[PDB]
Amino acid sequence: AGKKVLIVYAHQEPKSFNGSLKNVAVDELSRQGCTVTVSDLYAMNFEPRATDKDITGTLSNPEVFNYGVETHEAYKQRSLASDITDEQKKVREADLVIFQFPLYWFSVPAILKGWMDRVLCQGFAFDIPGFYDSGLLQGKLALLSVTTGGTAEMYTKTGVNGDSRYFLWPLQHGTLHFCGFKVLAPQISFAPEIASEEERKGMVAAWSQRLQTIWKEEPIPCTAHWHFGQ
Amino acid sequence: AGKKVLIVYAHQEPKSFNGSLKNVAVDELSRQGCTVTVSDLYAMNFEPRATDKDITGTLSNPEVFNYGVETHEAYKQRSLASDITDEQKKVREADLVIFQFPLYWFSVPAILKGWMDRVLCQGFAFDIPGFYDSGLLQGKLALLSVTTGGTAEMYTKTGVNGDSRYFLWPLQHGTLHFCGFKVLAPQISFAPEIASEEERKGMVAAWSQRLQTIWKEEPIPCTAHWHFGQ
Numbered sequence A, B: 001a002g003k004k005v006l007i008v009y010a011h012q013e014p015k016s017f018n019g020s021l022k023n024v025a026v027d028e029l030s031r032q033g034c035t036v037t038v039s040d041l042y043a044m045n046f047e048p049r050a051t052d053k054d055i056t057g058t059l060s061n062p063e064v065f066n067y068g069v070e071t072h073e074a075y076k077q078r079s080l081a082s083d084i085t086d087e088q089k090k091v092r093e094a095d096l097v098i099f100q101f102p103l104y105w106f107s108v109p110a111i112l113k114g115w116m117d118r119v120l121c122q123g124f125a126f127d128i129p130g131f132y133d134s135g136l137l138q139g140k141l142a143l144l145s146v147t148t149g150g151t152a153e154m155y156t157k158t159g160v161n162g163d164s165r166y167f168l169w170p171l172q173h174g175t176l177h178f179c180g181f182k183v184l185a186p187q188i189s190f191a192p193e194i195a196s197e198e199e200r201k202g203m204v205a206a207w208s209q210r211l212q213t214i215w216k217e218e219p220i221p222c223t224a225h226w227h228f229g230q
């Protein structure tokens, strides 16, 4: 309690394992007295494309469109599309942002990549200068709760997919830490489609249990060493 | 006889540096006598979201929607949406697929992430046991031509962003190699926005020149060692 959480959720099916992980997070954080908001991207038909429709005012350079430049100015002028502004309000108010999603091509599903691309604009999430430890979302926590098709064994240094931490780099470091977030350790629920009932129920309960003490956790040192080793 | 190339292009502005790199690739490959096709994703208003609209007719399990299962079965039953099958035909016929895009959050812009999520479905691009070296698109070459906002120095092992090979992992290994592609060395045009006209025309010319001998290149060894090792 005394804390606000935003869950950005990317799964098409409410009855899915991802849906269960999202719901147990809402249930537990709600039980604790926290304020909780969920952005259910597919239900919202969230727009993933970075286009000129994201700026409603006079463009700074109408001859040659540069998304980064135009959205940075639009942010400062308050002429960004309202769907972006609505997400920014949720992020600005949140103390913790949890991303719940199935891994798609070692990354986030495109609808969620679009949320990253359009919501975390210059001026709001970072500035130049004003990134990594000086990012604009400093003071906030972020956590990736991911599900995979591959087993934990396949996601090891000697497994076919390499260690799971490798694919986390662009997301935890390149995006979240870049914007100033401190990153909590990822929650990775491996191969639920293959797992049995005991195992699946076990994974949901492990997440619920972890959430009970989430406010006591320290963030990870989001560095190349943590991700790649040596 | 001859070679066929598909360029999957993701930039909103034809006058952009990315647009110029795409245009010189078309110009040079065409000059060589190659068959060239371009999927200009923003112009096509390409759908990035993975949804149940990607399957036509009736679902294999209309009670609990599973995107991966449904698209695998739709591929086998020739029931995928036409935008997806149109892209699959271009890929099936291509000997080389060049992805041209600006780096967005250490990855591809969401519209291109959506093309990978929706076009590279099970049965078409990979299956059990067709993945990595036995991926279904084996025999085809793939190449990432990326532009960045960050300078080359920032993308060094000890630079703030880490080595560029770190972010290439999910794309080169987790996506392209996984589907069986032999991956040519990436073309990285660092910070064209900061560079001078000469450094610019230079980066373009370097890409045009590389394309002159693209068919003589050998694929990189797509391994954890290549991306992280020393």
Ligand SMILES: Cc1cc2nc3c(=O)[nH]c(=O)nc-3n(C[C@H](O)[C@H](O)[C@H](O)COP(=O)(O)OP(=O)(O)OC[C@H]3O[C@@H](n4cnc5c(N)ncnc54)[C@H](O)[C@@H]3O)c2cc1C
Binding pocket: A011, A015, A016, A017, A018, A019, A020, A101, A102, A103, A104, A105, A106, A107, A147, A148, A149, A150, A192, A193, A197, A200, A201, A204, B050, B066, B067, B068, B116, B117, B118, B174
């Ligand atoms: C485009 C695409 C790209 C992909 N790329 C990758 C990749 O790069 N790497 C990778 O490893 N995988 C990849 N995958 C696989 C994907 O990550 C998995 O399919 C996904 O993570 C599984 O999560 P889910 O919620 O969809 O599972 P579900 O299909 O929902 O399976 C979970 C099972 O648990 C049951 N369940 C639900 N809730 C509960 C509950 N409360 N208690 C007990 N059981 C419950 C369900 O009914 C179901 O049978 C990809 C998939 C697609 C479609």
Ligand SMILES: Cc1cc2nc3c(=O)[nH]c(=O)nc-3n(C[C@H](O)[C@H](O)[C@H](O)COP(=O)(O)OP(=O)(O)OC[C@H]3O[C@@H](n4cnc5c(N)ncnc54)[C@H](O)[C@@H]3O)c2cc1C
Binding pocket: A050, A066, A067, A068, A116, A117, A118, A174, B011, B015, B016, B017, B018, B019, B020, B021, B101, B102, B103, B104, B105, B106, B107, B146, B147, B148, B149, B150, B151, B192, B193, B197, B200, B201, B202, B204
């Ligand atoms: C959502 C988002 C997220 C991002 N995340 C990242 C990230 O993770 N890491 C990162 O490093 N960067 C990131 N960026 C920055 C992005 O990668 C760069 O802005 C992009 O790569 C620059 O390419 P461009 O084609 O848009 O450049 P342009 O701005 O189009 O640059 C071309 C410039 O060169 C001039 N020019 C002169 N000669 C030529 C010629 N020969 N051909 C063409 N133009 C010429 C043009 O007139 C123009 O001014 C992000 C940007 C956005 C919007």
Ligand SMILES: COc1ccc2[nH]cc(CCNC(C)=O)c2c1
Binding pocket: A105, A149, A150, A151, A154, B067, B068, B069, B121, B122, B178
């Ligand atoms: C259903 O669609 C997809 C699409 C792209 C994918 N990449 C990887 C996997 C799962 C692979 N796990 C195992 C070992 O079975 C995958 C599934």
Ligand SMILES: COc1ccc2[nH]cc(CCNC(C)=O)c2c1
Binding pocket: A068, A122, A128, A174, A178, B105, B106, B148, B149, B150, B151, B191, B194
């Ligand atoms: C790493 O993440 C991002 C995200 C959005 C961005 N927009 C622009 C840049 C690059 C700016 N580089 C310099 C040299 O200052 C950028 C980087």
Ligand SMILES: [Zn+2]
Binding pocket: A172, A173, A174, A177, A178, A221, A222, A223
């Ligand atoms: Zn970091």
Ligand SMILES: [Zn+2]
Binding pocket: B172, B173, B174, B177, B178, B221, B222, B223, B224
């Ligand atoms: Zn590889």
